[PDB]
């Protein structure tokens, strides 16, 4: 007879949703915010079993968007922090190079006790410093929506300079290659994209859609972007992403009604992470038996 | 408030740390890493392949059966332990 045997500490985990601790280097951020000291540890181990991954439904990003907004509200009334899980909790990352938001069958997945560095930027129509600047170009696609966000390669660097914005910053060779991969992106329905594409701006009406919003040491910038498509403080920018809502009504022509939501920018930074609660309980059958 | 944020995480860790140790330590084993129990394993045909098998995959294979095996522990512990009290009375 094989009797039930209980095992403690075996590897097993499930989904989770809890807040995370602080981890940051720089001090003097709202009276230290009661934040723990940061440990220099970016180690990652190799795991074989696949694990489901998501970028829109994961709860890790949902707390960042609320936390970052709360910090900005205190100003009304630039930091680099990190989240480290407590004991019994871990973070997973998909090291697959073909990640596009949905990787239910990740070939190689790593387990890390802490996430990476992230940047907070309240900006619209552009992707500021970011952290996923890499040599690979890929675009996230929602299954429950078309909503997309495009990552930009670091080779172009898309130099931007703003004063008082004057910039060429076209990189005509850069845009030609990337859009051809949006056709080669895992799904692209109709709209063959044969040398015809226009970045149609949102229709007139509400002021917010008409003009962008960018912050440079606390400046509500509202300028015109019509030219390209068709003492005094100074700042730069290194573009790394761009929000967009892809929509089409006919196969002959397509209109890109780009969105202007700020929450999606932070989701890209932590889009390859999920929080899992480790259950150290395990039950196995063994021939052993307890005395009396 | 960030103060409530930090406090919420800490209390959750202890709240979890004892809940599993509360579900455990009532079956009979307090902190022993591995220990045996008198409950027979149901459906011996479901013996796992010890060579090619992982803990993560097999645990979700028996998720439906977890709720049934755990209940039988309560009866086993109290019933067997209780009878020992009366046995020693005569001696």
């Amino acid at each position: 007879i094989q009797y039930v045997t209980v095992f403690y500490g075996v590897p097993a985990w499930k989904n989770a949703t809890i807040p995370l601790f602080c981890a940051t280097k720089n001090r003097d951020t709202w009276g230290t915010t009661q934040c723990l000291p940061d440990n220099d540890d970016y180690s990652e181990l190799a795991i074989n079993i696949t694990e489901a991954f998501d970028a829109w439904n994961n709860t890790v990003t949902e707390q960042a968007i609320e936390d970052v907004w709360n910090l900005f509200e205190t100003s009304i009334k630039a930091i680099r922090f990190r989240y480290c899980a407590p004991p019994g909790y871990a973070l997973l990352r998909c090291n697959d190079s073909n990640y596009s938001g949905f990787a239910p069958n990740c070939s190689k997945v790593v387990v890390s006790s802490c996430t990476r560095m992230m940047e907070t930027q309240t900006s619209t129509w552009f992707g500021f410093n970011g952290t996923r600047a890499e040599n690979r170009t890929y675009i996230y696609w929602h299954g429950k929506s078309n909503r997309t966000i495009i990552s930009l390669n670091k080779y172009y660097n898309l130099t931007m300079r703003c004063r008082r914005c004057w910039f060429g910053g076209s990189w005509k060779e850069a845009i030609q290659e990337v859009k051809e991969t949006l056709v080669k992106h895992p799904r692209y329905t109709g709209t063959n994209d044969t040398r015809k594409i226009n970045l149609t701006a949102p229709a007139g009406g509400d002021p917010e859609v008409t003009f962008m919003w960018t912050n440079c040491r606390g400046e509500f910038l509202y300028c015109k972007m019509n030219w390209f498509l068709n003492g005094d403080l100074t700042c730069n920018s290194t573009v790394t992403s761009l929000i967009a809502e892809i929509d089409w009504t006919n196969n002959n022509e397509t209109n890109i009604t780009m969105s202007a939501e700020v929450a999606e920018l932070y989701r890209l930074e932590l889009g390859d992470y999920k929080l899992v609660e480790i259950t150290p309980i395990g039950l196995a059958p063994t021939s052993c038996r307890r005395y009396t | 408030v960030w103060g409530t944020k930090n406090l919420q995480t800490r209390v959750t860790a202890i709240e979890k740390y004892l809940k599993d140790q509360a579900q455990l330590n009532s079956w009979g084993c307090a902190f022993r890493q591995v220990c045996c129990t008198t409950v027979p394993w149901p459906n011996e045909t479901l013996v796992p392949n010890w060579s090619n098998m992982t803990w993560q995959e097999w645990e979700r294979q028996v998720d439906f059966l977890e709720a049934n095996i755990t209940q039988l522990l309560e009866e086993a512990q109290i019933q067997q332990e209780k009878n020992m009290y009366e046995l020693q009375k005569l001696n």
């Epitope: 007879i1 094989q2 | 008198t38 027979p40 394993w41 149901p42 459906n43 011996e44 045909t45 067997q80």
Partner: antibody, heavy 115, light 107 residues
């Protein structure tokens, strides 16, 4: 969960083939250990053989020289024996072999009779 | 081969009394025992298996125990439902040995 049913002739003369069928519904014959037991009207239970649906094990009693097939077909199995003896007549029951698992079911069975 | 000695097949008992049924083991079978109860003209149903492992259907009245050489079955109370024939089964070795059955008749 399961609704075991069976049927049989119920009238077998001595020295003819013995055929009895027990139907399996809601479960797979393979992967389950099955056995056949008969209840004599006066005597108690007696073990007469064992068979495994996995096909990896085959254990019979070396006193009755009897074999039982495990043809799946449509999830059914039956008993095969020839030259029935007078002492071998009894009420035949179909059920899985007793094991150390929570699940075990038995069929009502039917009586076999000889002249 | 081994021989099993069962309790007497004849039993007269009154309500509220304790009934003990035993079938002795010839050697250390290591609690591979099982029990069954067959009604007249009906199939048996498991009550207790593996010496001490409760099966759904009766809260506490049926409870066996014993290991090694000594084995016993203790019933706290007798009820109208408990009736028929009782058997104990062992499967440690290939040649099985069975009991004589108890033609229990209450009064």
């Amino acid at each position: 969960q399961v609704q075991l049913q069976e049927s049989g002739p119920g009238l077998v003369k001595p020295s003819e083939t013995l055929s009895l069928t027990c139907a399996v519904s809601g479960g797979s014959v393979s992967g389950n250990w099955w056995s056949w037991i008969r209840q004599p009207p006066g005597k108690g239970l007696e073990y007469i053989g064992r068979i495994s649906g996995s096909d990896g094990t085959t254990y019979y009693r070396s006193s009755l020289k009897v074999t039982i097939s495990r043809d799946t077909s449509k999830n059914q199995f039956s008993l095969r024996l020839n030259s029935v003896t007078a002492a071998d007549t009894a009420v035949y029951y179909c059920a899985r072999k007793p094991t150390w698992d929570w699940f075990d079911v038995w069929g009502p069975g039917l009586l076999v009779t000889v002249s | 081969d081994i021989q099993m000695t069962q309790s007497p097949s004849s039993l007269s008992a009154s309500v509220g009394d304790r009934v003990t049924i035993t079938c002795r083991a010839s050697q250390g079978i290591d609690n591979y025992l099982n029990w069954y109860q067959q009604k007249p003209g009906k199939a048996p149903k498991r009550l207790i298996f593996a010496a001490s492992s409760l099966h759904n259907g009766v809260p506490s009245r049926f409870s066996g125990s014993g290991s090694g050489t000594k084995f016993t079955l203790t019933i706290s109370s007798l009820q109208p439902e408990d009736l028929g024939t009782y058997y104990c089964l062992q499967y440690y070795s290939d040649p099985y040995t069975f009991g004589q059955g108890t033609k229990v008749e209450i009064k």
